[PDB]
Amino acid sequence: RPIIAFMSDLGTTDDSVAQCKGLMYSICPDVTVVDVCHSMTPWDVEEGARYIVDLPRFFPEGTVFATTTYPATGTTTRSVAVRIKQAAKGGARGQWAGSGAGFERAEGSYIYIAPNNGLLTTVLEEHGYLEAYEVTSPKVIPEQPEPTFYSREMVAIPSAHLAAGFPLSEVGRPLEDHEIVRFNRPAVEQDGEALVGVVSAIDHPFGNVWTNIHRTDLEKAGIGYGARLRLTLDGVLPFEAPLTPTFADAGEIGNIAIYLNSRGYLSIARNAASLAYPYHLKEGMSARVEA
Template structure:
């Protein structure tokens, strides 16, 4: 039985998600449809990329991930279907797969151009319903991806700053995401550096490197590698971003004591 996940910035109070699900249920009624999230910040493709990097690997091989965070809808940006790491993706070619493809080989990708996979009338502002959902349904029904359109290899990648490794015990990075709890997630991954004990420095503030939030008292700051493998700035039972005025692209330095 096919599994389809949905990731969008649509929210749930408007009819957009329901319309996409309606297309999927009409075209592939036996598929399992899971909502990953519809709370991606509006037009935030990098946030969508982070969500896919963290959540998609936990689904079974063969899962179809329908990702619609599409600020360029109706323009020349390409709609694509892609296979990578045992999973299938249907999304705009706008960088939503950047982080996934940084860790998994691209097996194939097609620009979706087949009229047969679209709804009867394609809106210039809702490709999620009229192009992406029908393409995902076609794949869920066992369709050959090659019938969707023409092969492509040059997928768009978001330019994310790479961590700057000064030496074995010091690395500089930036905050690339702030989650629901106010934890500030950086571009530094565990494998980037061998620092096992030390602190993260942001300006004059030091955040001791810990293993879990409870290693410090409630209200106290810390840094740790989160469940997704990225270095995070946090406050135990608090909101680090608000408490310290942190934002996207704020520089952080991880150093040994």
């Protein structure tokens, strides 16, 4: 029962992902391959990062995360394979996932394999890591890798060797911290009483609006449930709602809800209606909150 959770930019409109899965079953016959999603904006490492950072706590320990967008495919670049440290609690409150008090996950229990292009930036900062390796061994990758399909050659193939029990430390040399590429994560700016950030994503298929203002940012300003907030979107939209746990707390259908989403971030929405879709609100718009 080893598991590979597969997140790519290959789409679901042809056999690309299927080619990867075939090789995964060829290499690790008893594997379960779980699709994260294959629908990310290609080459957008910051977005792919979002789909992979919250994963470990939800999976049984020993799960391998094969995560890939590879614009540098067919170059001398090689992937990185990391064993993370903290599985890490998540959500609005910061807790373990599961029934009861949740399923506590041990440390050093998940492997991420990805292009060394910054895709694992937030995984590394939010979980830490115990070890990190360049993926170079002809035992886990092709000697002649397909120039335009490194998402298969350099992620999917070796992830299945790792899931079969190939020793992580044998995929290639240890990587020093600085050799692991990171993208810049823009910071939430304290601006007087206000916290100033950005709309980080539109929560599809609902049209909810997610910000990069985390619960840790809020509580450092002393903002918890009940706080009457002004959340200004796009510079000109001063929404006004108390912070509430969930959508229905806005009252009637269509009413504005300000809440902490399931990833732990300040968000805004309408109760059982779309906020973002009718007004064509977008990722990257400004987002400011204050009491």
